[PDB]
Each structure stands twice: as C-alpha cells, then as structure tokens.
Amino acid sequence: STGSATTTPIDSLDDAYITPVQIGTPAQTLNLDFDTGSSDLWVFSSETTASEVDGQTIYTPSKSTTAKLLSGATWSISYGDGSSSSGDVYTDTVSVGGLTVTGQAVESAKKVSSSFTEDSTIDGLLGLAFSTLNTVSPTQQKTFFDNAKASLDSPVFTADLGYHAPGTYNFGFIDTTAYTGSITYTAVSTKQGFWEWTSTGYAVGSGTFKSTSIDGIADTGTTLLYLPATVVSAYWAQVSGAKSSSSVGGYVFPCSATLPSFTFGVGSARIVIPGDYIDFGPISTGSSSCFGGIQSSAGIGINIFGDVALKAAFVVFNGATTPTLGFASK
C-alpha cells in the first residue's frame, strides 16, 4: 500500500504545516501537524476542556462506530517549545492520503496548553519519530508509520515541504519526479528516539564550505533551524545590522536586509537554503526588526534541522530495519 497527502502552511510565514487526516467511521477529518520529532498522535476532542478549544475541529469518539476506549491508558506530553497536552486514549481507524491503519492509538486531549488553544489551524499532532518516545501509559503505543510500515510497498515516508506553498507527505514510495539529482542517504541514530543524523558542515552565502560534524535531528514539527552558536554567529555576521536580542529571544535583523543563503552538508552532497527562507518577518506587527530563521541551539541541548532546512530538500525517512535519512535537492 501507499498514501499521499498534501501538507499546507498554516500562515504566510510557514510557521507549521497541516495535513488532513481521516479518523473514525464515518470519517472525521482533522488537520494535523505531522511531527518527525515526536511520537504521539493526539487530537482536540469532545473531551477537551471547553475553554481550551478556540476554533479547532474536534474528534468525537462517541460518533465513530470503530472507536474503542483503550482502558486505563493516559498520555501527557511536553514539547521543546514549552507547550503541553494530556488526556486519554482511543483506538480507531486512521487514514492519511488513502493509507489506512486500523487500531491506531488516537490520543484524545482533555487538556492542552495555551499555545495550542491559540492556534485555531492545528487540530492535533501526528508523531513520526520512533515509537520509543510515545507517552501513552501504562502501555506505550505505536506511531501511525510504525503501524503502517509492514503493509507499505517500501518502509519509508517522505517529506516535501513547500516554501510559502503546499507540499506533500508520501508513505510507502519515493516519487522520483519530486526532486532533482540524486538522494544522498546518511546514517541515523535512534538512541534518543529521533531521526538523528550528522551533517558534514555548512557554508554561508557564497563562502567556503566548512567541513565539521553537526549532529542534529530532522524535525518537521519545529519551524526554525537551530544550530551551534558558532555556526549561527557566522551566518548572522554576514547580515548588516543583525544581532542577538535577549529580549526578543534570538537573532533579529533589519527587515530591509537581503539575507544570504545557508548550505548544509549531507555526506558529500549540499542542500542550499535560499536566504528568503530564513526571513520570519517583523518581530511584532509594523516593526522593521525581523526575526531570523537560523537560531542558536545552545539552550536546547540538541541541534534541530526544522522546517527552514527541510523545506529546501526532498527528505526520505527510511524506516528499514536499520533506519537512514535521505536528502535531495528539488
């Protein structure tokens, strides 16, 4: 089997991407944030505290003839941005882009943190990291991809995120028309539950490539590119007037600037992030100070190849017995 679904930016900055997901019988379609940095499929629901729902579409398990309460199971998650959610668990039929999993754990939110409530466009998350990170207790549950894998034509999914435009998540096949050149594959460590890999270095603009190992995670659920402070300083030094602002929370730059590209290495291959992908717009409405798309990871504990990096590539998440990642230009 295969599946193919369009993923759409939630706003004009590409802050996140939403993909329609069919849950239950008859189908209830919710727009979920596919997140290769986490492993829970959770949704706003008829159980979510009413004051914490503000425009999201909800899953109502009582209206699904295939929903079954997973007795005794609860979940609770906290994300790297400080947001969180928790609740109980159903199993139900879940379909993405024509690919159907029966008995998928659907984690129904009883509580969500304010950042979720305040984003009416995201109805939940669909985790695509390794199932070892799934938070369901007392019996950990499998991700949608883990449940689908054995049925897929090939045990892979691909992320093809657009810049200011829709893109595609495919399951079970490589669309060889969706990228240019070849796909360069690179080793993955699953020891932390992430799609963790090592970039071979970077360049700023037309500058020379610096060969250096940068361990980080491929994370579709993180907007920005978080890299070591040395690398980030080297990038922003090429933007006149850019500076790190403690009060804003990162590097800012004059909105009048033209940003240089940023290249990262995948083995001997190179992925070029155009400068425009690094502009996240005014820090507040009407400001001439703009927020940068490359930020320091120093306070995170891990480097994160988020959407800024991934949307410059066609990315293969190869879930074979020994997982690997592939990157191609497009």
UniProtKB/Swiss-Prot annotation:
Any coiled-coil regions, as ranges: none
Organism: Cryphonectria parasitica
Entry similarity comment: Belongs to the peptidase A1 family.
Source domain of life: Eukaryota
Entry's EC annotation: 3.4.23.22
A GO term, aspect molecular function: aspartic-type endopeptidase activity
Domain Peptidase A1: 17-328
Residues annotated as catalytic: D35, S199
Protein name: Endothiapepsin
Lineage: Eukaryota, Fungi, Dikarya, Ascomycota, Pezizomycotina
Disulfide bonds: C255-C290
Enzymatic reactions: Hydrolysis of proteins with specificity similar to that of pepsin A, prefers hydrophobic residues at P1 and P1', but does not cleave 14-Ala-|-Leu-15 in the B chain of insulin or Z-Glu-Tyr. Clots milk
Gene: EAPA
Sorted UniProt keywords: Aspartyl protease, Disulfide bond, Hydrolase, Protease, Signal, Zymogen
GO biological process: proteolysis
Transmembrane portions of the chain: none
